[PDB]
């Protein structure tokens, strides 16, 4: 039934509470639900049901819904991976949940367990004790401290580990990878006062040079713990420069060829950079932000082979948070919009669906013809995407049109992209035409529907197969209708797209009749029969309908 | 040189046995993959070494061992990448070995639900199998063509590419199972597939043209004995995407 | 037969056989599957001599959704979503309703519940699912015996009754159809509002139904082949 608790390091975004932020949550929530279905590891879902994504994040309590964690899960976690990672619970959550700031899980007394284990492990690594066992005991402390709940547990751990650091040999490897993040986690819960900060900075700075790659990855999780603190200026002016030089050195080299390199190293380095740019924007160097955004762009602009899928989604979801965070300088934010549009136009449905999410957050963060160059990317992705992409692009499109354009500027494109012989999915476009016309009827703007129906009726009678011309007009007259019981039938029209039985002709006659009874003056009432008469050959649906109108 | 490479294979397999104990034999919830990170770094240095020593087939062996490990340890996307690196290192000198490696990459992409990626690896295999194995193929390459044909047709019925992504090779494959004109029977077999499996594939491709879901349900139980379990998973996804389409949010 | 001389073709295909073939192609629906053939047969006979209101919409939706089919279920769920809430329950509880719509209806209705609003469709589909689950459990033998593929050891009292219940076609096809709907409800039931959690009077019927469904699937393996 269950998987391990997560308490992520990143707070809820305030941008999503704004008027346009609320509108972004609906549209980017549609795209999120489809990225989850397509690339989630599904590790906590047993059954096939596509839309059952949840995260083990309780209200610091009951679970917070996946909708309300939108860009909150830690960047270095693979999508849907519920396995234990170094970083499960943030220091702000240890503080807020335990009422410490610088015991029973499900009836079980976990205070008794964690107290007993601190007593054993401290006496067993500080006696003459087997070296094969010390690292496994310190692994146990690093893990079990997610259960610790009183400050004296972290004090006892910090003292024990900082003694073990001077007791154990300086040539170590298999211990250091646990000792560094365990010491930093303890030190971070203890608040990084000068009594602890200088020892911890010296351990972090020196262990970033370690040849063993897990000792570097452990140092980077140590850094991610200590960066949650309200650091003192004399630590921030010395520690932050060492991290930023280490990040710019190791990312800038590998970014063109990521798959040659260990995935957890690239993922943890990105997570540090995103937390630095969001939370330390004044303290990190002037080339930072800009240079990170460029070399993350070089990862996203890779191939399906050179940039692995989990690193593609990490880097993208990180950049996407940095832009809804208000903290970018405008030249960095505008550079990220330029990086987004070049990655929607790609082969793979999931890589394009993610790049669409990024484009949407850019466009709702920016709130005059330049929006039209963006909408033509959405229409192109309906034309050239697989059905599983194009059906999603068609569901978001009505709101994107209504939020960025006056209807008149896109009404030409909406009807043309439904009529085009180069449209593979006219049954997806039918619901777009419907939602655009029913929006105009809701805003009292019903005259614009009389106009655009009659202005385009002769393009519809030029559809090449008569089944596809009798259809399409049935969608159009359903989409134009003011009667609610007619406007309800669109799914029955869409399910019959290829058909031309007597009921498909009768429906076309009825729905064209009711528009002619209730929405069409004599000059229109005649011109409608004139455009119809051109195709009213003795057996055609148009002849059968001309008899119903002419009587 | 070869002794240093050997020692790195043993030192990698040590961390990889240690990972298998924690992950597969103990099923430990606290098994974050520090030994796997050490194994992937160790083989990264050793693949660099075997390629500087100019022997691609010995580097490809490390890539197959790591790819198999990542698949067993529940990371099929990372496995599919290492199987394609093995295939690329084998292909200039051992075409059947490269086809075997691409077949495992395609199985890993299917485990990872990356169906458009699996479709592209099966097309690469069917090309390479005609290019090195030929219109009749030799028996080993013929078994690869037979896998690729059946897998590609089910993947194309699952994904249904638009005209913009219906490649010449996809259109050419599908038309064998389809009708060109209103009085055409559909094409006769070239003898590639058993006649019974070929008639059931033509029936399936035709039932998806005429939207006959009762026929697809009947053909699913009838084809079950004839398919591999991987192909029975593909055919399950075709019947599932037929009855409950993805991308609607319902 | 059209290209040949009529006096030979009228002897090859008598009018009584032409009329038998014509009636059969209509009654089987094969006329609509093979329209060119039926058109050629009726040619051979010639050669051998509204207001769209609520209740119209309900008649339209009935023509799609009171069937047996699996062809357009997401579109069918949207059509019953526009039937009025006071008509919905009686529309779904009728014998002629398509039980394949219930999972689509629960999935569509849940997307309204997760949008912050009441779903009449979800309420009707949940009640109909639970009522049908209880209604088929009432047909099981009153004392349950363990399913054992090797030995139907209790013949008259029990295994004869299961051999009549499973393999009926009409009942057996209903069980995994209902189980698709029951599973669509059980995967959401923890996310739902408090009044839409599982009724405590239904919990035994649900366990009896789940057991009977794996027993029916096992019975189908033994007497036929791999289930769908």
């Amino acid at each position: 039934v269950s998987c391990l608790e997560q308490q992520p390091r990143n707070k809820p975004l305030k941008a999503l509470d704004t008027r346009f932020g609320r509108k972004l949550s609906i549209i980017r929530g549609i795209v999120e639900q489809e990225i989850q279905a397509m690339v989630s590891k599904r590790e906590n879902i047993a059954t096939h049901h596509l839309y059952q994504a949840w995260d083990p994040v309780p209200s610091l309590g009951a679970l917070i819904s996946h909708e309300k964690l939108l860009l909150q899960i830690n960047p270095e976690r693979e999508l849907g991976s519920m396995s234990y990672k170094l970083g499960q619970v943030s220091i702000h959550s240890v503080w807020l949940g335990n009422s410490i700031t610088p015991k029973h899980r499900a009836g079980v007394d976990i205070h008794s367990c964690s107290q007993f284990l601190l007593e054993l492990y401290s006496r067993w690594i500080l006696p003459r004790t087997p070296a094969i066992l010390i690292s496994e005991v310190v692994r146990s402390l690093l893990v079990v401290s997610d259960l610790f709940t009183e400050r004296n547990q972290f004090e006892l751990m910090y003292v024990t580990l900082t003694e073990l650091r001077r007791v154990h040999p300086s040539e170590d490897e298999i211990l250091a990878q646990y000792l560094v993040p365990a010491t930093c986690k303890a030190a971070a819960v203890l608040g990084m006062d000068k009594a602890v900060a200088e020892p911890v900075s010296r351990l972090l700075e020196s262990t970033l040079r370690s040849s063993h790659l897990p000792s570097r990855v452990g140092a980077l999780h140590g850094i991610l713990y200590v960066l949650e603190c309200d650091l003192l200026d004399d630590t921030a002016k010395q520690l932050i420069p060492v991290i930023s030089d280490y990040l710019l050195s190791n990312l800038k080299g590998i970014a063109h060829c990521v798959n040659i390199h260990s995935q957890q190293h690239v993922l943890v380095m990105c997570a540090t950079a995103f937390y630095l740019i969001e939370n330390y924007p004044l303290d990190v160097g002037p080339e930072f932000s800009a240079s990170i955004i460029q070399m993350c762009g070089v990862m996203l602009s890779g191939s399906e082979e050179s940039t692995p899928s989990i690193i593609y989604h990490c880097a993208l979801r990180g950049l996407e948070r940095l832009l809804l965070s208000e903290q970018l300088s405008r030249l960095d934010a505008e550079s990220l919009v330029k990086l987004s549009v070049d990655r929607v136009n790609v082969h793979s449905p999931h890589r394009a669906m993610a790049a669409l999410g990024l484009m949407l957050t850019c466009m709702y963060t920016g709130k005059v013809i330049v929006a039209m160059e963006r909408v033509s990317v959405l229409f192109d992705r309906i034309r050239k995407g697989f059905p599983c992409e194009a059906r999603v692009v068609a569901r978001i499109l009505p709101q994107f049109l209504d939020d960025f354009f006056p209807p008149q500027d896109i009404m030409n494109k909406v009807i043309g992209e439904f009529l085009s012989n180069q449209q593979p999915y006219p049954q997806f476009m039918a619901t777009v035409v419907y939602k655009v016309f029913q929006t105009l009827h809701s805003t009292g703007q019903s005259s614009m529907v009389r106009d655009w129906v009659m202005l385009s009726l002769s393009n519809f009678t030029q559809r090449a197969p008569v089944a596809m011309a009798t259809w399409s007009l049935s969608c159009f007259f359903v989409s134009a209708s003011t009667s609610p019981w007619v406007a309800a039938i669109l799914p029955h029209v869409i399910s019959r797209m290829g058909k031309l039985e007597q009921v498909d002709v009768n429906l076309f006659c009825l729905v064209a009749t009711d528009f002619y009874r209730h929405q069409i003056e004599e000059l229109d009432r005649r011109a409608f029969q004139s455009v119809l008469e051109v195709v009213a050959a003795p057996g055609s649906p148009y002849h059968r309908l001309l008899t119903c109108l002419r009587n | 040189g070869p002794g240093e490479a050997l020692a790195l294979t043993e030192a990698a397999r040590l961390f990889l046995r240690q990972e298998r104990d924690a992950r597969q034999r103990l099923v430990c919830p606290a098994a974050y993959g520090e030994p796997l990170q050490a194994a992937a770094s160790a083989l990264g240095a050793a693949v660099r070494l075997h390629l500087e020593l100019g022997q691609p087939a010995a580097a490809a062996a490390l890539c197959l061992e790591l790819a198999a490990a990542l698949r067993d340890l529940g990371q099929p996307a990372a496995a599919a990448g290492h199987f394609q690196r093995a295939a690329q290192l084998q292909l200039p000198q051992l075409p059947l070995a490269a086809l075997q490696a691409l077949g495992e990459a395609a199985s890993c992409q299917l485990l990872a639900r990356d169906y458009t990626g699996a479709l592209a690896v099966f097309t690469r295999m069917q090309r390479l199998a005609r290019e090195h194995g030929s219109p009749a193929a030799l028996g080993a390459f013929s078994d690869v063509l037979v896998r690729c044909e059946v897998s590609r047709v089910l993947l194309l019925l699952l994904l249904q590419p638009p005209p913009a992504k219906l490649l010449p090779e996809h259109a050419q494959t599908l038309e064998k199972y389809s009708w060109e004109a209103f009085d055409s029977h559909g094409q006769e077999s070239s003898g590639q597939l058993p006649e019974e499996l070929f008639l059931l594939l033509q029936s399936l491709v035709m039932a998806t043209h005429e939207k006959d879901t009762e026929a697809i349900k009947s053909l699913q139980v009838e084809m079950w004995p004839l398919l591999t379990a991987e192909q029975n998973h593909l055919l399950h996804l075709v019947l599932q995407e037929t009855i409950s389409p993805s991308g609607q949010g319902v | 037969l059209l290209a040949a001389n009529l006096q030979s073709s009228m002897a090859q295909l008598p009018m009584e056989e032409l009329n038998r073939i014509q009636e059969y192609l209509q009654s089987s629906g094969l006329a609509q599957r093979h329209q060119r053939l039926y058109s050629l047969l009726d040619r051979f006979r010639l050669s051998t001599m509204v207001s769209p209101d609520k209740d119209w919409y309900v008649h339209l939706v009935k023509s799609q959704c009171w069937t047996r089919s699996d062809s357009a279920l997401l579109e069918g769920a949207e059509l019953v979503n526009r039937i009025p809430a006071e008509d919905m329950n009686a529309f779904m509880m009728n014998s002629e309703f398509n039980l394949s719509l219930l999972a689509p209806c629960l999935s569509l209705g849940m997307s309204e519940i997760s949008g912050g609003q009441k779903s009449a469709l979800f309420e009707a589909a949940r009640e109909v699912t639970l009522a049908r689950v209880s209604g088929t459990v009432q047909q099981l033998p009153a004392v349950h015996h363990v399913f054992q593929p090797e030995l139907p050891a209790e013949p008259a009292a029990y295994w004869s009754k299961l051999n009549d219940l499973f393999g009926d076609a009409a009942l057996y096809q209903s069980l995994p159809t209902l189980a698709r709907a029951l599973a669509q409800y059980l995967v959401v039931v923890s996310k739902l509002p408090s009044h839409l959690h599982l009724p405590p009077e239904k919990e035994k019927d649900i366990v009896k139904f789940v057991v009977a469904t794996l027993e029916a699937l096992s019975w189908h393996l033994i007497h036929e082949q791999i289930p769908l």
């Binding site: 012989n421 290829g498 | 249904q160 005209p163 | -």
Partner: peptide
């Protein structure tokens, strides 16, 4: 009969019979 749609390879449309 049915015939292939020209706008999509997987879509088919009716023609009068």
């Amino acid at each position: 009969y049915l015939i292939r749609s020209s706008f999509n390879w997987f879509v088919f449309v009716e023609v009068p019979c």
